[PDB]
Amino acid sequence: PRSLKKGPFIDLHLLKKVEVAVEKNDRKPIKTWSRRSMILPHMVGLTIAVHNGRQHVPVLVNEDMVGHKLGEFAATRTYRGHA
Amino acid sequence: AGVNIPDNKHTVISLTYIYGVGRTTAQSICAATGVNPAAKIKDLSDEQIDQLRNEVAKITTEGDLRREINMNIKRLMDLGCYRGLRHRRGLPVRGQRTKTNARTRKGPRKPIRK
Amino acid sequence: QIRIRLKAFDHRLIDQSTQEIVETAKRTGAQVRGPIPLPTRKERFTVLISPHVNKDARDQYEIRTHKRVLDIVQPTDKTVDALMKLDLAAGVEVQISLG
Amino acid sequence: AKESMKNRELKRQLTVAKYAKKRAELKAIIANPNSSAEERWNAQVALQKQPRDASASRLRNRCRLTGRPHGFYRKFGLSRNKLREAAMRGDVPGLVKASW
Amino acid sequence: TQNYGTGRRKTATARVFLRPGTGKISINNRGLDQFFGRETARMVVRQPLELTETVEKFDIFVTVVGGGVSGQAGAIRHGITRALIEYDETLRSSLRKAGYVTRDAREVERKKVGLRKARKRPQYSKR
Amino acid sequence: PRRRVAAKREVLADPKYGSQILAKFMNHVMESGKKAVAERIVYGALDKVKERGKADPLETFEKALDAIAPLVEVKSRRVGGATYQVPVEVRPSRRNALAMRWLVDFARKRGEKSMALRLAGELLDAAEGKGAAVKKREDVHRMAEANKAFSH
RNA sequence: GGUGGGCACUCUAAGGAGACUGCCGGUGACAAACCGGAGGAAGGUGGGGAUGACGUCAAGUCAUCAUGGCCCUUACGGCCAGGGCUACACACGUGCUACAAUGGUCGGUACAAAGGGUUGCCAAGCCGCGAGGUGGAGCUAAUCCCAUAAAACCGAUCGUAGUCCGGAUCGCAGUCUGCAACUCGACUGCGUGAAGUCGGAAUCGCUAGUAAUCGUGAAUCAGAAUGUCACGGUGAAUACGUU
Ligand SMILES: [Mg+2]
Ligand SMILES: [Mg+2]
Ligand SMILES: [Mg+2]
Ligand SMILES: [Mg+2]
Ligand SMILES: [Mg+2]
Ligand SMILES: [Mg+2]
Ligand SMILES: [Mg+2]
Ligand SMILES: [Mg+2]
Ligand SMILES: [Mg+2]
Numbered sequence: 001p002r003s004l005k006k007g008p009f010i011d012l013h014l015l016k017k018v019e020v021a022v023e024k025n026d027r028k029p030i031k032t033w034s035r036r037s038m039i040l041p042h043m044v045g046l047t048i049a050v051h052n053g054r055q056h057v058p059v060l061v062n063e064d065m066v067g068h069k070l071g072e073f074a075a076t077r078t079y080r081g082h083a
Numbered sequence: 084a085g086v087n088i089p090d091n092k093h094t095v096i097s098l099t100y101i102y103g104v105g106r107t108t109a110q111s112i113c114a115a116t117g118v119n120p121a122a123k124i125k126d127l128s129d130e131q132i133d134q135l136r137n138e139v140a141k142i143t144t145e146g147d148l149r150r151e152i153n154m155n156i157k158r159l160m161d162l163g164c165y166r167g168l169r170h171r172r173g174l175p176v177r178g179q180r181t182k183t184n185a186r187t188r189k190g191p192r193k194p195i196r197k
Numbered sequence: 198q199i200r201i202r203l204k205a206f207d208h209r210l211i212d213q214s215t216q217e218i219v220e221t222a223k224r225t226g227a228q229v230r231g232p233i234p235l236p237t238r239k240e241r242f243t244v245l246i247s248p249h250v251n252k253d254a255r256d257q258y259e260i261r262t263h264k265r266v267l268d269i270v271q272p273t274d275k276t277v278d279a280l281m282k283l284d285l286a287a288g289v290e291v292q293i294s295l296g
Numbered sequence: 297a298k299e300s301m302k303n304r305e306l307k308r309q310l311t312v313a314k315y316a317k318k319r320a321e322l323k324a325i326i327a328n329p330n331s332s333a334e335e336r337w338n339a340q341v342a343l344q345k346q347p348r349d350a351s352a353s354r355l356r357n358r359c360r361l362t363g364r365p366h367g368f369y370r371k372f373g374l375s376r377n378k379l380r381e382a383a384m385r386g387d388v389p390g391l392v393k394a395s396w
Numbered sequence: 397t398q399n400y401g402t403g404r405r406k407t408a409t410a411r412v413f414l415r416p417g418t419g420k421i422s423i424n425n426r427g428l429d430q431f432f433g434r435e436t437a438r439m440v441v442r443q444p445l446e447l448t449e450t451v452e453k454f455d456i457f458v459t460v461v462g463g464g465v466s467g468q469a470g471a472i473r474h475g476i477t478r479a480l481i482e483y484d485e486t487l488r489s490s491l492r493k494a495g496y497v498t499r500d501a502r503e504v505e506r507k508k509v510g511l512r513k514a515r516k517r518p519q520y521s522k523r
Numbered sequence: 524p525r526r527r528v529a530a531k532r533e534v535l536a537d538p539k540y541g542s543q544i545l546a547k548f549m550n551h552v553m554e555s556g557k558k559a560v561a562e563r564i565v566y567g568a569l570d571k572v573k574e575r576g577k578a579d580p581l582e583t584f585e586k587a588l589d590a591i592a593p594l595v596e597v598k599s600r601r602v603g604g605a606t607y608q609v610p611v612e613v614r615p616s617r618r619n620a621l622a623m624r625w626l627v628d629f630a631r632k633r634g635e636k637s638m639a640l641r642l643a644g645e646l647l648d649a650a651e652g653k654g655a656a657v658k659k660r661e662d663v664h665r666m667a668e669a670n671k672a673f674s675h
Numbered sequence: 676g677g678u679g680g681g682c683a684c685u686c687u688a689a690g691g692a693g694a695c696u697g698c699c700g701g702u703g704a705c706a707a708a709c710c711g712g713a714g715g716a717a718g719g720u721g722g723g724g725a726u727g728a729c730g731u732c733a734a735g736u737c738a739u740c741a742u743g744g745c746c747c748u749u750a751c752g753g754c755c756a757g758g759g760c761u762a763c764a765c766a767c768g769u770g771c772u773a774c775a776a777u778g779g780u781c782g783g784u785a786c787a788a789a790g791g792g793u794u795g796c797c798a799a800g801c802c803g804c805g806a807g808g809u810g811g812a813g814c815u816a817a818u819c820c821c822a823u824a825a826a827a828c829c830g831a832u833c834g835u836a837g838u839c840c841g842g843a844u845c846g847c848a849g850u851c852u853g854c855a856a857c858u859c860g861a862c863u864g865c866g867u868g869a870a871g872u873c874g875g876a877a878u879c880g881c882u883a884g885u886a887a888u889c890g891u892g893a894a895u896c897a898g899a900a901u902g903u904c905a906c907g908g909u910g911a912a913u914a915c916g917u918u
Contacts, residue, residue, distance in 0.1 A: 001849080001856075005326065005336075009855070012344050033757060036855055053758040065162050071757090072165050072857040082764045093832080096839055105866060106839080107804090121832075148867080152846055165857060174763085175844075178859060181763050187844050187869065195764055206390030212689070234688040236817060240790085241394060242369065242894080243509070243904050245376055249736045253510035255904085257725085258383060259394030263688085264817095288389070297739070300753065316794095319854095329809075343854055352794095353853055353897050364739050368895075377739055395724040396506075400684070406884075407788065407907075411685060424786095433785070433828040435559060436538040461685080464908045465786055465827075492715090499716050502884050504788090505723065507905060514723090516886075519879050521768060529882070529914060552777080555888045556910030559827060560777050601918065614915065624912090636834070637776060 010037045018043055029058050035071025050074040086145060090125040097124045103144040112138045199272060202292040203265040211263050214289045221277050228270040235264035297363040305358065311350045399482045403475025405500045408463025410471035414479040417455025424459055437469040444477045444496050474499060551623045567639035572646055587649035591626060592618040593660050595667045610667035610674060629656040
């Protein structure tokens with residue numbers, strides 16, 4: 001895990017796109033390519049479509065998984081099954 | 084006697100058994116309520132066994148440990164997280180090899196078709 | 198009382214330079230104590246020789262650095278300072294201290 | 297070892313060398329304990345907005361003659377195999393085959 | 397007075413001084429027993445001295461550097477043998493027959509390319 | 524080999540007892556280059572033998588060795604059509620090594636506290652011949668006797 | 676060796692002597708040469724390394740490089756962000772750790788070689804269980820740092836029990852570099868604690884400082900070695916012989 005000298009980590013464009021989304025409530029999913037972003041507790045309730053590699057998978061965030069990275073919930077390997 | 088602690092052994096050696104205390108925190112408990120580590124637990128007066136019970140009950144052991152581990156694991160599968168998703172398959176979650184040599188988390192060989 | 202250090206890749210040239218500086222310093226009357234061979238520095242390299250997969254075919258190469266130390270007593274004439282082109286020619290490095 | 301690969305890694309070299317101090321300043325700000333979150337967050341934003349292709353971790357040193365990434369000896373500037381040619385020709389000073 | 401000797405064995409070196417005295421036997425400014433702890437070093441060291449029945453007549457002061465405990469013991473043995481034969485130059489044949497003057501020459505063989513140790517090799521599956 | 528040029532380096536490094544056979548037993552019992560451990564194990568077994576038997580352990584060890592040294596052994600031979608075993612007498616030198624190897628191998632697997640009393644028990648057993656090593660030596664001998672039809 | 680000092684010794688590195696069947700006995704076609712002995716530190720090309728003949732396998736490499744052709748020109752040429760090469764019902768090769776008492780822990784204690792360091796090493800004190808943090812000395816290095824070798828010895832304990840063995844897996848919280856450790860790094864603290872009782876057919880390495888076993892360093896490199904290359908400590912057994 002990241003050293004505690006830097007708690008959060010969000011790309012600046014993502015911040016300025018979601019810091020707008022706090023004054024006005026959740027109204028539209030945010031299309032995101034940054035998988036390294038750390039979700040802060042004060043954006044709970046929004047829908048974020050994270051880039052899988054082909055399409056953007058949308059996810060909803062609540063307080064339970066605040067301590068996790070964005071792309072952690074978006075897998076990239078299919079594995080439909082050997083048989 | 085805790086939860087059926089063994090006798091005829093050194094205090095800390097038997098104190099490793101309470102399922103939540105190893106050897107370091109076991110020695111910490113032994114030195115907190117000062118008793119001889121080299122003394123056999125059989126020759127231990129009951130006037131300190133109650134203090135050892137207090138020390139054990141301070142943090143956790145057996146049942147509470149089961150509860151906490153299982154609740155922690157349960158909030159992983161439901162969340163849709165990658166760690167829980169792999170934890171739902173028997174595959175290792177830290178990121179070891181899977182092309183081969185993932186045996187401790189797949190049990191027997193279970194050969195193809197037979 | 199000055200101290201002189203000599204570095205070279207090849208021992209023959211450093212020996213020639215040490216003899217030259219000893220002769221120049223002694224011939225003017227200034228006293229000189231004998232040279233000190235400092236331990237050499239050997240660096241080794243193991244390199245693959247095939248353009249493609251042959252792991253056991255390898256070459257070993259070595260670079261050797263030789264160091265010599267000199268010191269003088271009773272400094273009266275300093276001509277070797279102006280004889281730098283004489284002292285060093287192509288591959289010997291000379292350092293001087295406590296002039 | 298294309299021409300484009302050499303040109304575009306020269307790009308990394310140029311960009312990294314051109315700043316060469318602002319990274320040190322921002323890392324001094326961050327690493328210093330008594331800096332306060334007020335003077336740490338602005339440094340974080342400064343580091344983030346600065347172009348990504350100006351970092352030491354973004355540089356891969358290649359042969360100065362062909363640009364082969366693997367088989368590099370930083371004692372020289374040469375690749376795995378041109379070292380052998382130069383040594384055999386006798387261009388590398390002080391280098392001989394060793395047995396010991 | 398005194399006599400000097402040098403002994404080397406397996407990258408270990410030892411300087412020995414043999415003087416008139418009662419055999420104080422100091423190893424690196426320490427007693428012989430206090431240096432070698434529960435091993436065969438003591439008697440193999442004293443072997444040349446006990447063979448010439450002159451254990452105490454010669455005080456021995458040595459310094460040993462490099463190698464290991466067995467190598468140091470061998471170096472001391474060779475050095476004191478040299479020091480003795482620098483005093484009694486009629487027992488040369490005695491220590492030839494004893495085999496104490498000939499220096500050991502075996503040294504740690506180097507590692508080679510394609511091998512793990514000096515001579516060990518990988519398994520070489522035939523397929 | 525094919526030359527018969529290999530030398531025979533002589534090792535005799537008994538520290539205090541000054542015994543030759545003891546030295547070869549040391550070399551046999553030593554494992555992974557641990558000479559000191561072998562010294563302590565063998566000397567503990569020897570001291571147990573002393574504190575048990577009033578006889579000096581030197582001769583007890585010697586008579587145990589001489590009661591486990593075989594005289595003939597069976598060796599396979601490729602006749603070119605059958606699997607045959609022929610009895611051959613032991614070389615005078617080889618029997619000592621055979622006895623040492625058998626003794627140490629059988630002593631390694633007692634299951635009691637340590638090899639001190641393990642080797643002590645084996646030396647006492649083979650002093651008069653109630654040990655498993657002597658039994659297996661007799662079994663080898665009876666192989667050789669039951670295959671005497673070849674002999675040669 | 677802290678200082679004066681010494682050129683005694685070790686040590687460092689340059690130049691040199693020494694081993695050439697040289698001498699003796701025996702054999703041998705009184706040849707070549709063979710078997711012992713003296714002296715000798717070393718005796719029979721002393722030990723190790725580099726050195727690979729004419730050619731073979733249309734062996735490998737067009738992806739290190741060069742190069743005769745053939746191929747694309749809005750792309751089979753370029754730029755950027757994410758993902759993969761680290762996937763997983765299985766099989767194979769090469770290693771590491773084990774299955775313990777020739778050992779696991781605890782306390783104090785002894786001896787090596789080799790090497791790297793000024794876009795570097797990075798000490799002292801102090802703060803943290805720890806990984807680590809402030810701090811800045813000294814060093815362009817036989818001077819300062821990396822950095823305290825381990826196995827070994829002694830004393831206490833464990834008593835053969837899947838165990839004071841073994842450590843995978845897993846849960847929680849950390850530390851370091853890097854813009855960024857989810858896919859996908861290495862280490863740290865607590866806890867759980869698995870398979871594993873020496874392994875079939877078959878199969879591998881090794882002739883003396885060798886096998887076995889214990890530790891140390893370098894390269895690549897912001898970080899990432901159970902791999903590669905290199906250095907020492909302890910230290911064996913066996914060779915009747917050529918079917
Ligand atoms: Mg090109
Ligand atoms: Mg890189
Ligand atoms: Mg060497
Ligand atoms: Mg080794
Ligand atoms: Mg095979
Ligand atoms: Mg072909
Ligand atoms: Mg091909
Ligand atoms: Mg791959
Ligand atoms: Mg051979």
